[PDB]
Amino acid sequence: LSTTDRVVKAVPFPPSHRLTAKEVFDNDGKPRVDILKAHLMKEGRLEESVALRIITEGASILRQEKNLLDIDAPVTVCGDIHGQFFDLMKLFEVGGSPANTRYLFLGDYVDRGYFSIECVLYLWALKILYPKTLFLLRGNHECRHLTEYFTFKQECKIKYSERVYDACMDAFDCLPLAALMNQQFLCVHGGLSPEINTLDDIRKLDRFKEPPAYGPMCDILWSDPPENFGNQEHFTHNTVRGCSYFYSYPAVCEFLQHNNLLSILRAHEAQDAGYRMYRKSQTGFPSLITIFSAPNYLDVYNNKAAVLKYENNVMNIRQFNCSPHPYWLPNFMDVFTWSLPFVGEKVTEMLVNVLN
Amino acid sequence: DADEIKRLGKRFKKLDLDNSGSLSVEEFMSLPELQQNPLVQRVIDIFDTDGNGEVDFKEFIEGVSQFSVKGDKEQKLRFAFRIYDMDKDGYISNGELFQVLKMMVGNNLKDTQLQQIVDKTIINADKDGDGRISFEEFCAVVGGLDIHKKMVVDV
Ligand SMILES: [Ca+2]
Ligand SMILES: [Ca+2]
Ligand SMILES: [Ca+2]
Ligand SMILES: [Ca+2]
Numbered sequence: 197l198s199t200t201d202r203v204v205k206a207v208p209f210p211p212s213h214r215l216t217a218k219e220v221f222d223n224d225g226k227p228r229v230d231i232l233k234a235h236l237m238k239e240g241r242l243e244e245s246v247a248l249r250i251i252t253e254g255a256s257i258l259r260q261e262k263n264l265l266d267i268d269a270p271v272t273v274c275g276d277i278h279g280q281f282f283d284l285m286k287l288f289e290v291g292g293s294p295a296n297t298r299y300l301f302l303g304d305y306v307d308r309g310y311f312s313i314e315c316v317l318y319l320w321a322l323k324i325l326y327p328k329t330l331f332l333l334r335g336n337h338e339c340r341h342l343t344e345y346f347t348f349k350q351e352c353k354i355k356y357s358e359r360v361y362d363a364c365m366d367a368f369d370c371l372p373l374a375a376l377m378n379q380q381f382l383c384v385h386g387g388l389s390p391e392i393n394t395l396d397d398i399r400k401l402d403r404f405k406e407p408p409a410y411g412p413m414c415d416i417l418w419s420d421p422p423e424n425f426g427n428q429e430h431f432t433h434n435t436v437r438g439c440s441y442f443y444s445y446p447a448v449c450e451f452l453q454h455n456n457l458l459s460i461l462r463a464h465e466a467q468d469a470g471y472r473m474y475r476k477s478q479t480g481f482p483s484l485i486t487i488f489s490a491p492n493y494l495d496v497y498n499n500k501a502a503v504l505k506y507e508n509n510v511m512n513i514r515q516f517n518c519s520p521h522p523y524w525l526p527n528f529m530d531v532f533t534w535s536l537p538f539v540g541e542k543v544t545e546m547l548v549n550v551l552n
Numbered sequence: 553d554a555d556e557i558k559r560l561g562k563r564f565k566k567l568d569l570d571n572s573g574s575l576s577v578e579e580f581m582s583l584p585e586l587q588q589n590p591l592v593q594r595v596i597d598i599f600d601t602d603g604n605g606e607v608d609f610k611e612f613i614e615g616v617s618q619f620s621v622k623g624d625k626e627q628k629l630r631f632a633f634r635i636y637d638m639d640k641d642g643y644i645s646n647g648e649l650f651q652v653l654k655m656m657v658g659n660n661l662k663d664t665q666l667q668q669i670v671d672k673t674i675i676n677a678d679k680d681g682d683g684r685i686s687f688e689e690f691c692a693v694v695g696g697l698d699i700h701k702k703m704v705v706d707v
Contacts, residue, residue, distance in 0.1 A: 199646075199647035199648075199650055199651055200646055200647045200650075202667060203663045203664070203667050204663065204664045204667065207664060209671075212675065354676075523665060525669075530669070530672070530673050530676065530677075531653065531666075531669045531670065531672075531673050532673060532677075532693060532694070535653065535656060535657070536632075536694070536697075536699065537699075538656070539632075539635065539656060540632065540699060540702060540703060542591065542656075543591065543595070543635065544702070544703065544705075546586075546589055546591060546592070546595060547595075547619070547705065548705070549583075549585050549586070549589075550580065550583070550586065550595075551563070551616075551705070551707075
């Protein structure tokens with residue numbers, strides 16, 4: 197077999213050429229997302245200046261949005277992505293083209309998916325091109341603490357630069373926290389907070405910062421209902437997450453009555469069916485519905501994903517399975533860093549045994 | 553050192569089963585723990601600086617001399633460098649990088665994955681565009697790992 201030519205010729209070699217500004221942005225500055233989507237589907241890269249321009253324009257757009265957007269129905273609401281770009285592609289296949297479909301994402305684009313930067317670049321391009329039909333919220337993994345704890349930083353340093361990582365972090369600081377859907381539904385990543393009694397408490401927060409390790413921003417991003425939800429304390433220490441709180445059914449009913457809301461929608465915890473309906477409020481309407489859009493969580497859970505398309509006064513849950521993606525070694529390690537310890541170990545073992 | 557010359561004489565004589573004055577691959581492989589080591593032929597080939605398939609006494613001495621306690625960091629890292637550079641031109645090229653990874657990993661990687669990561673390492677690490685990795689780039693990549701501390705042998 198040749199030592200220079202490629203072994204598996206049926207696999208097309210990804211392009212190395214970095215797209216220039218004229219090839220990706222038309223005369224008016226709008227992203228050419230079909231070309232960009234094909235290139236990213238080929239594992240193609242951008243010129244550094246173009247990635248930085250996309251990231252900063254998307255950050256500026258998020259920066260100009262309200263904490264709580266006013267978004268009419270119809271809309272498709274989507275949960276965690278976690279770097280599963282080819283599953284993001286399937287999500288858009290199932291929900292419909294952004295050219296004529298309103299979208300809401302509930303966060304967790306980054307942290308352990310191995311296409312986090314591609315997810316960011318594509319979603320930012322769609323947000324710039326479709327500022328009022330594609331929407332992105334912040335999740336709890338969209339922060340420096342976790343992205344430095346998990347693998348996102350290594351991904352940025354392997355494919356781009358640490359400067360691109362910092363640009364991502366500043367864009368993430370701009371991500372809205374919540375959505376008001378059809379003037380009826382509050383949509384968030386995590387859930388409720390002890391420090392939010394009115395919508396004005398959300399509007400008054402300063403979001404342009406790394407999320408703290410504790411406090412209202414943390415709880416907004418991190419809290420969950422109890423695993424035994426529905427089956428007397430309003431807020432109890434969340435022992436699963438190590439931060440924020442579990443909220444109780446009386447807490448939820450009180451929030452709903454005080455704020456004139458119908459239901460709450462959040463993500464962050466995998467479910468075998470892709471959704472869970474908990475104990476109904478004291479009308480037959482479920483008081484809470486969880487939707488989760490991250491299939492095969494951690495590449496091992498084998499779970500389905502779902503999205504919720506709310507349209508024509510119908511809430512249609514559409515599930516989908518995960519899709520194949522190309523392989524990366526853990527933490528984006530290159531083959532020299534990966535293999536040199538083993539080489540030195542086995543060569544030393546051989547030499548020691550031959551000599552002694 | 554006298555005891556070192558004596559030990560090298562005794563080991564050379566003990567390995568030269570047919571008393572030909574040179575060690576063949578088969579002669580190394582007569583040692584049972586070497587029969588299942590898949591990298592024996594590569595190390596022998598590296599020792600065989602004249603390419604005649606066997607290790608003469610001069611080659612043996614020069615090879616052992618690079619593992620002395622008095623050897624400096626550069627000597628060890630240059631031996632490791634020479635491990636990959638089968639053709640001894642001073643640069644790791646695509647073909648030899650593929651060959652050496654294939655020898656070391658066996659079935660631990662599929663041909664597609666290994667070829668992909670070879671491509672990506674060449675692309676990300678080549679800074680002068682010649683498609684191969686110079687010594688400067690090597691030290692830029694590995695100089696900070698402190699691996700030199702483990703490549704020490706007591707003769
Ligand atoms: Ca012989
Ligand atoms: Ca030979
Ligand atoms: Ca050649
Ligand atoms: Ca090459």
